Amino acid sequence: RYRPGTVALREIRRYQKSTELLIRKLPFQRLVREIAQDFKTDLRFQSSAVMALQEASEAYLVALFEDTNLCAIHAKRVTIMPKDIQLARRIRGERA
Amino acid sequence: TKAARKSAPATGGVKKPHRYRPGTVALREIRRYQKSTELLIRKLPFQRLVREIAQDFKTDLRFQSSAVMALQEASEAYLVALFEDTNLCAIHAKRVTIMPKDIQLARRIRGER
Amino acid sequence: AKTRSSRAGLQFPVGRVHRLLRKGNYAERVGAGAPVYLAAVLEYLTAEILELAGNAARDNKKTRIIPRHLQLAVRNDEELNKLLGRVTIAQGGVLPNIQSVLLPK
Amino acid sequence: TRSSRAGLQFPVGRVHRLLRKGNYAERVGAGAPVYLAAVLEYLTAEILELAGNAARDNKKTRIIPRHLQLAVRNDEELNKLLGRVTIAQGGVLPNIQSVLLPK
Amino acid sequence: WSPLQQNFMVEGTFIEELIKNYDLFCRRCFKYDCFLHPEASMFRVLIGTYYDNFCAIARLIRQVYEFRVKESXXXXXXXXXXXXXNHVYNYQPCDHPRQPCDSSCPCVIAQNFCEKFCQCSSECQNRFPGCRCKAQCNTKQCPCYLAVRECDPDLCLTCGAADHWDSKNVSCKNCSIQRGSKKHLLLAPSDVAGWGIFIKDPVQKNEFISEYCGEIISQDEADRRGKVYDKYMCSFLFNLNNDFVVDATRKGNKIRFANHSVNPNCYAKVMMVNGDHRIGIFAKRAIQTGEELFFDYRYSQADALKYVGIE
Amino acid sequence: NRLYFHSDTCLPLRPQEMEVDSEDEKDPEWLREKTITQIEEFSDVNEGEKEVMKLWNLHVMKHGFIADNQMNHACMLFVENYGQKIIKKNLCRNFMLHLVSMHDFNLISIMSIDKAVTKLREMQ
Amino acid sequence: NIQGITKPAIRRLARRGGVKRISGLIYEETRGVLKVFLENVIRDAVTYTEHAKRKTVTAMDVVYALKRQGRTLYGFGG
Amino acid sequence: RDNIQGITKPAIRRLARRGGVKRISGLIYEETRGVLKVFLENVIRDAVTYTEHAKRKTVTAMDVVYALKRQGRTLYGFGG
Amino acid sequence: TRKESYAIYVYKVLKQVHPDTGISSKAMSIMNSFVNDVFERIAGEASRLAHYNKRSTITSREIQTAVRLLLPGELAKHAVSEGTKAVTKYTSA
Amino acid sequence: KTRKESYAIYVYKVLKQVHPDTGISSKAMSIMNSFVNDVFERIAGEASRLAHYNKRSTITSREIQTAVRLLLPGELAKHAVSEGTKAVTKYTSAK
DNA sequence: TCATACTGGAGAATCCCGGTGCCGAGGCCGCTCAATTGGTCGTAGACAGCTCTAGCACCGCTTAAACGCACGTACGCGCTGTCCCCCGCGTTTTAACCGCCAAGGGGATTACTCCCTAGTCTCCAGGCACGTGTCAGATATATATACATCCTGTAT
DNA sequence: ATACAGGATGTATATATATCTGACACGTGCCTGGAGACTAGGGAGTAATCCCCTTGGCGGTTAAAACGCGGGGGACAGCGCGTACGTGCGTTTAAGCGGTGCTAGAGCTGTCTACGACCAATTGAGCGGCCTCGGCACCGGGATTCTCCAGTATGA
Ligand SMILES: Nc1ncnc2c1ncn2[C@@H]1O[C@H](CSCC[C@H](N)C(=O)O)[C@@H](O)[C@H]1O
Ligand SMILES: [Zn+2]
Ligand SMILES: [Zn+2]
Ligand SMILES: [Zn+2]
Ligand SMILES: [Zn+2]
Ligand SMILES: [Zn+2]
Ligand SMILES: [Zn+2]
Ligand SMILES: [Zn+2]
């Protein structure tokens, strides 16, 4: 039995080495269609556009989580909290 | 030798000077500076610093007072925004006093290097 | 109606906007309806800003609008704050905001 | 042609036509396209040199987007230039904070 | 005993040792040589105060001109100075010819504030300012109450010290000694020791009962008289300060008949009123009609004050 | 009933005879005679400078002036009450000297020197 | 729908970001932020497509929408 | 030379009071001076470049406005 | 020499919405800068759209799409309604 | 068909000139093309902004030099300026 | 004599080598259309000259803020202790993806007309600077007011 | 003998109020950019057609998702404390207003031209389609290297 924290670092290294998409295709596509249904119904999308949206969302979420980790380490703590994400989005200027 | 005197001397004492507790003057100055809109940084020292900084790129340069005033206003606004973000970060740290690590984190989150 | 703005019921100059778009090097050819649309949008925007500024001045019992009133009117709105996010105003100031944690019991 | 007259590889004619149809100005100078092509060629040469170094560092012959991401993020000037730019299939740098490390 | 409203300044082996021991105007009181403090000429006098005001220099006696041609925050700062600067001395005016009040000033030397009688600078940091109160100002917070001194009828222009004087009952309750407003007293055989004094009407706590008048004598005379007074087992001596002592035996007031009770109803204050050290007696608690007055003599040895036996 | 006594005279106080009297009034009576006999004792105080002082001292004792602002009203009362006697004894100019002194001591306004010599001489 | 982003997906996204320990109240906030971002970019793309008088959203529209928001993305012929 | 010390302690104190800071430490002045110097260097480099491109020897306000707009710090109140 | 501004039109709008209300010169310069900034943003957006659609003409449709993209929902909707009303009034006469 | 433009031939030629035994995939080629287009449009925008600021309707090599000095960091901008000056010299030598 | 630190040792996810298979890329061939060349006409811009104007050194005086020092205090950090909540693992479920096959409709392409605007010549008043009158607000003094703070009376 | 509440007291402070002025509001002249009128011609709207790019449906299987246990390290409440910051005061020191002289540089104007736009021919450098293979992906196996548990020497 491994101690807590070892598998976390191992997974960190594994996911930082590889570059595949952690989010699967169909659910993200269904979410995109549901979000686009509110603006206009009966719309069609290309697979390349869905893949590009997924890539952009994954990159944005990775950057936001890295900033949240920086904020949590600066807060003399280890566990991240929603207030860390809120402060990160406030300092970045993405929140009024 | 000594007489059986009756005496009730009360030494007494003067009143201490009126002294505010720490933190009140800070809030008073905060309200005063948030009400007013004047330039907190004075003109002559900021102008001399600007002239020294511009001397390194090219010597024998002349500047208009309007340009110096605009630079001062922009720098003051940028410093005010940075200090506000630093105060937010210090508040998130369950503390009140700001530290240089707070400014470092603020400049890191803003993406400034 | 000699002025096209009177023909459209606006106050902003259509001729000046058309000349700026021609000399602006923004495109090869310029449409006829674009300057009227742009002037109407700009007039509506400045009217909203002036309405908020007039409200703030009546809120402060004053007759002449100061840049402080403009700063308050821009920062009190949500859409204008989202629009003018990276915009600074000279002699504007900040809103009188104080956090709850610094207040005593 | 004209690229041979300057000893470059980027097309000068293509850039001149793009500047004409680019609606950036009324008239276009003659020396501007050569300058722009030279600057772009130097930039792409620097990027390709860093990518080739990273690929030799990873024992590979063909450059993958991961090599481009590593070469851009490892440099300072390229990182300052491409700050708001994301690369598909790029990845992140292997960075781990010190506080999370065990004893 | 003579009745007095104000103090009066005056300049076998037991017997063997007693024999061995033997080997113009007063601005402060506004009178002439008090007992508390130790046409040509017409024109010459008028010029000393009018300075060539012929219109008056003549009306008070051309002619005058002919004879002339012929002859030819801050308050707080002072509090800090007091802090920076139980023996008590008597106040005396200070005079600095060519300097302000400094460490060499007699006032600060004796550790006392400058009074309106001091000829020092108007803004002399050693000058004690009045109180800015709005009411009786009888609480510790009042600088005039904290400092036992009574309010001044010319500085404390808010609490009412300068108000009308006929109605002795005035707003500021820190001027009783000035007016001398004391309650009516009655002399009768004390149930404790010989004679005694009772109060006619009821009074409330910390209410000025009355002043303890008596002659002011030097410090050596204090002991000289106290020796024989102790030999009598009866003594009215009361140390006023390091400078003088109060002796009301020969002359004083009715209050002199007050006795002592370690659990008394009245207490004494050595108060500085108008630059004069005076003994006052206040109600240590609510007192009713007919009650007798007592206060702690504060003796260190119960030579004769140990009878007790009084409820 | 407790029986009370007078302090000067230890006779008992009858229930109708009381006639309330503090007998500890603002100024004692023996003091007035004391002051009169003490002023006269002064060698080198020309006859006139002996009477006006006695009159003034008696006047302030009678009214009990405490404050400086009273001294203007006090110099006015001293003529309203003692001016007739001042004229009888020909102390008018010594009373003027007194008024000048009192002004020197910063007690009275200068308009009261004139106003006083005026009031005194207006009834001459 | 919005629940298609499962808990292990956000867990892996946090492992990629360097998070060691995650609380149980982060998934809702992450879902909300992702929904806001997707709504914004989809509105922009739909506007560009409606101006083109077309009914299909291509990749160039998404590239333009990301470039306009200061999020220029490479790898699609932008 | 030494003009960097012209930003006195009370000036930064007032700037922090305006920003809402309640308590300030004694190690903030160096960091604030460094950040201000970096910002001034950036905007001055931009303005000097615009002025050299104008074939002039005097820096006007339009150049500073353009440099601030290029840095994403658009400032109003000076025209343009 | 001569130079252009927007003081007369801004003053006219102010007097139309507030007759008894003044304005200083600094606020006027601020309003002029704001108008120029909004104008240049919309012109740049229109040029980018024209280059994306391979068209060398800027009509009212491009401006409408640009104002829909640059402003938030309610503000953009109000601006679009105002622009359509102005275009109708201009095409009537 | 549509005759679209690209930069694959020139990028491949530069790569073979700096690295003969080195390949490249199509995704990296598209990334390089997008990067070249982004740098090109940024420099063109800077040149247009300078021309409009100076009230001049002509874009010469001086505007491009100032734009590349403003957009790139110090050492990179210096190297790019040296390369541009060498290219201008080689172009002005012949015609 | 108990707590702690450091070394040895048994032991599981992971790295490297060899083999096999595969599809995107570099070379190739056919194709074609926009860069190149020679030539002419036009004007945006460089150059020199003159006029004016504000940026800068200069001093002198006045003065509020900067500086240093004393004294007091309250909280950032450290330490302790106490509860608990995601992580590692195991077991059960499940739908994403892959491969394949139909089907259609909107994007791309081509040809047609057509209308609106860039252009040119002519003429006028809206807006520009310039000048001048004028009161809203800055400036200064005093007063009523709000409030932080300290001592005292009261209930347990 | 404690702890909370209430009065009052000195200190900072919104508000009346009479003055002076310079920035704000308004009159006036004149010019050039905007308005009228007519024309060519090329970009744009629309009809028609192709197809390939998108959408829809079904079978399986297997890595990913989901649920529960327990647990130990992490989150969090509470007290000591002593030091760095807040507040106040004396000192002074540098900041700010009033004018002072003036000159190098910003700005407008007359003049010439050499560099750039427009156009006819053309051809070769650049683009679409094919094709084989080897650098890279996948998989099995063995060595490698870390990762945790327990015991022994050392401090106090
Ligand atoms: N309660 C008491 N018992 C015995 N002696 C007392 C006393 N109270 C006061 N004395 C004495 O009286 C002197 C003070 S005079 C007190 C009043 C006086 N006994 C009278 O009846 O009029 C003191 O010296 C003291 O020794
Ligand atoms: Zn006296
Ligand atoms: Zn003295
Ligand atoms: Zn004195
Ligand atoms: Zn004195
Ligand atoms: Zn008082
Ligand atoms: Zn008093
Ligand atoms: Zn009083």
Author numbering:
A (entry chain H): 40 to 135
B (entry chain D): 22 to 134
C (entry chain J): 14 to 118
D (entry chain F): 16 to 118
E (entry chain A): 113 to 123, 143 to 154, 284 to 297, 431, 441 to 463, 469 to 479, 492 to 504, 533 to 758
F (entry chain C): 562 to 685
G (entry chain I): 25 to 102
H (entry chain E): 23 to 102
Published text:
The histone methyltransferase Polycomb Repressive Complex 2 (PRC2) and its regulation by accessory proteins and histone modifications represent a prime example for understanding these interaction mechanisms. PRC2 trimethylates lysine 27 in histone H3 (H3K27me3), a modification that is essential for the transcriptional repression of developmental regulator genes that control cell fate decisions in metazoans. H3K27me3 is also recognized by PRC2 itself, and this interaction allosterically activates the PRC2 enzyme complex to facilitate deposition of H3K27me3 across extended domains of chromatin. In particular, the H3K4me3, H3K36me2, and H3K36me3 marks present on nucleosomes in transcriptionally active chromatin directly inhibit H3K27 methylation by PRC2.
We assembled recombinant full-length human PRC2 in complex with its accessory factor PHF1 (i.e. PHF1-PRC2) on a heterodimeric dinucleosome (di-Nuc), which consisted of a ‘substrate’ nucleosome with unmodified histone H3 and an ‘allosteric’ nucleosome containing H3 with a trimethyllysine analog at K27, separated by a 35 base pair (bp) DNA linker. Single-particle cryo-electron microscopy analysis yielded a reconstruction of the PHF1-PRC2:di-Nuc assembly with an overall resolution of 5.2 Å. Using particle signal subtraction and focused refinement on the interface of EZH2 and the substrate nucleosome, we then obtained an improved map at an apparent overall resolution of 4.4 Å which revealed well-defined density for the H3 N-terminus. The visible sidechain density combined with the crystallographic models of the PRC2 catalytic lobe and of the mononucleosome enabled us to build a pseudo-atomic model of the histone H3 N-terminus spanning residues R26 to K37. This model revealed that EZH2 recognizes the H3 N-terminus via an extended network of contacts besides the previously described ionic interactions near the active site where H3 R26 interacts with EZH2 Q648/D652, and H3 K27 with the aromatic cage above the EZH2 catalytic center. Specifically, our structure suggests two hydrophobic hotspots, the first one involving H3 A29/P30 and EZH2 residues F667, A697, V699, I708 and F724 and the second one involving H3 V35 and F542, F557 and P558 of EZH2. H3 G33/G34 is likely not recognized by PRC2 but might act as a flexible hinge between the two hydrophobic interaction sites. H3K36 is directly juxtaposed to the EZH2CXC-DNA interaction surface and appears to be involved in the EZH2-DNA interface. The side-chain density of H3K36 suggests that the epsilon-amino group of H3K36 engages in a polar interaction with the carbonyl group of Q570 and possibly in long-range electrostatic interactions with the phosphate backbone of the nucleosomal DNA. Taken together, our analyses reveal an extensive network of interactions between EZH2, the nucleosomal DNA and the H3 N-terminus.
